[PDB]
Design a protein around this motif. Sequence first.
Motif, PDB file in Angstrom:
ATOM      1  N   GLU A  19       0.784  -1.213  -0.098  1.00 43.91           N
ATOM      2  CA  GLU A  19       0.055   0.096   0.151  1.00 43.91           C
ATOM      3  C   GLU A  19       0.864   1.046  -0.215  1.00 43.91           C
ATOM      4  O   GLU A  19       0.551   2.406  -0.519  1.00 43.91           O
ATOM      5  N   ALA A  20       1.960   1.329   0.754  1.00 41.25           N
ATOM      6  CA  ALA A  20       2.824   2.450   0.724  1.00 41.25           C
ATOM      7  C   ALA A  20       3.142   2.886  -0.684  1.00 41.25           C
ATOM      8  O   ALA A  20       3.198   3.994  -1.029  1.00 41.25           O
ATOM      9  N   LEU A  63       1.631   8.692  -4.753  1.00 42.53           N
ATOM     10  CA  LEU A  63       0.689   9.608  -5.390  1.00 42.53           C
ATOM     11  C   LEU A  63       0.640  10.661  -4.322  1.00 42.53           C
ATOM     12  O   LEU A  63       0.401  11.879  -4.981  1.00 42.53           O
ATOM     13  N   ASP A  64       0.391  10.516  -2.912  1.00 40.15           N
ATOM     14  CA  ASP A  64       0.538  11.611  -1.964  1.00 40.15           C
ATOM     15  C   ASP A  64      -0.641  12.508  -2.188  1.00 40.15           C
ATOM     16  O   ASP A  64      -0.521  13.590  -2.441  1.00 40.15           O
TER      17      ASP A  64
END
Length: 15
Positions: A4-5, A11-12
């Motif tokens: 997931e990170a 994308l943040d």
Amino acid sequence: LDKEAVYFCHLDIIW
């Protein structure tokens, strides 16, 4: 977290 990170760290965006 781990794979997931990749999504969120890169994308943040809350979205």
